[PDB]
Amino acid sequence: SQQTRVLQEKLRKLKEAMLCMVCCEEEINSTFCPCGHTVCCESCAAQLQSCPVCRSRVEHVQHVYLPTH
Amino acid sequence: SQQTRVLQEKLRKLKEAMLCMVCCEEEINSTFCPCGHTVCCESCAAQLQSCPVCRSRVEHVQHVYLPTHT
Numbered sequence: 064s065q066q067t068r069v070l071q072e073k074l075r076k077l078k079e080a081m082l083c084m085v086c087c088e089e090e091i092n093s094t095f096c097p098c099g100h101t102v103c104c105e106s107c108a109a110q111l112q113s114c115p116v117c118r119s120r121v122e123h124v125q126h127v128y129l130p131t132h
Numbered sequence: 133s134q135q136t137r138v139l140q141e142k143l144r145k146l147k148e149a150m151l152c153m154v155c156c157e158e159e160i161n162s163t164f165c166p167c168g169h170t171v172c173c174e175s176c177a178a179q180l181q182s183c184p185v186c187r188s189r190v191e192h193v194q195h196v197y198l199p200t201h202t
């Protein structure tokens with residue numbers, strides 16, 4: 064039905080929100096500290112000296128173990 | 133259709149996985165450091181001395197801003 068198409072789009076968008084905002088290919092699993100923005104995979108997070116959301120300096124990257132992983 | 137029911141179930145399960153493992157009511161937005169388990173809301177994370185998943189000592193809690201926050 065048309066509702067099947069609507070639900071497929073909602074699921075696709077929720078899954079895309081869990082993917083790295085830089086490479087778009089790997090799951091988010093890293094937090095920039097101290098700002099807390101959690102928007103990258105470990106490979107993209109390792110290559111950024113400043114947060115891509117707020118431009119704060121990255122003091123270090125904390126790996127996150129999420130239940131959605 | 134039955135396909136619509138299957139997709140509704142998938143969506144519901146993904147949304148439930150984003151909720152705090154202790155209160156089951158608020159979104160996860162806190163990480164236990166240094167272990168990295170990110171399974172609680174701020175209130176529930178605040179008084180735990182050890183991680184509820186791996187038992188490691190909680191040195192501090194890091195707030196996390198996730199793109200899925202609704």
Ligand SMILES: Cn1ncc(Cl)c1C(=O)N1CCCCC1
Nearest residue numbers: 085086087106107108109110111
């Ligand atoms: C230009 N740049 N500087 C740091 C990072 Cl990260 C990037 C970046 O956009 N990419 C593309 C996707 C894969 C990782 C590298």
Ligand SMILES: [Zn+2]
Nearest residue numbers: 083086104107
């Ligand atoms: Zn990436």
Ligand SMILES: [Zn+2]
Nearest residue numbers: 098100114117
């Ligand atoms: Zn930031």
Ligand SMILES: [Zn+2]
Nearest residue numbers: 152155173176
């Ligand atoms: Zn809670």
Ligand SMILES: [Zn+2]
Nearest residue numbers: 167169183186
């Ligand atoms: Zn832990």
